[PDB]
Amino acid sequence: VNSLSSPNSLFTGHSLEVGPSYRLIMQGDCNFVLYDSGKPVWASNTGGLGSGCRLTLHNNGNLVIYDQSNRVIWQTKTNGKEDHYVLVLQQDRNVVIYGPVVWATGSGP
């Protein structure tokens, strides 16, 4: 899976992955980093700032990193219209947040 949609979360150790060799992981040291074949190409730089962190994408578009005590360790603070959004790790290696919802098949949830 290379997407995380509102209001889902990426708990400690969880990651999104897409070809050719990309992995976006929520590490145990609270550092949210993007790997390219073993090379860190991007990171929230919050390594060591918390324990049991999770990356939550809220329904308003705000992407937040919370520690085990629910403290806001990091956030893009891009919260707007209360709807549904998605975090996408792309094959072009860019990680993007899109929203709100424009259309759906209704085949889910």
Next chain:
Amino acid sequence: VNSLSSPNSLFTGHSLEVGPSYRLIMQGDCNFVLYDSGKPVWASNTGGLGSGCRLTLHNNGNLVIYDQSNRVIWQTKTNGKEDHYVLVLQQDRNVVIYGPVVWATGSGP
């Protein structure tokens, strides 16, 4: 990969896939259908309406099916602000279009 971003396309035979057992395929008969373990749970119902079809998600949010002669076989007609959008096949089995872009890492393209 379980995502298709503007203005990319899913040519004949191509598909998105996500767990547990979901596959969104652009078939050769031009029918755009969602499969759940081999069971069709959703479709554009355009099977047999064209040849060499492709599913294109434009930068304005409009998702269109074109035959080999560029004829508009099907469309969600959800075109709005010219930006960048994404079509996501979700683990909850719903297929959603999100946009515009809210944030990106800049780690790509």
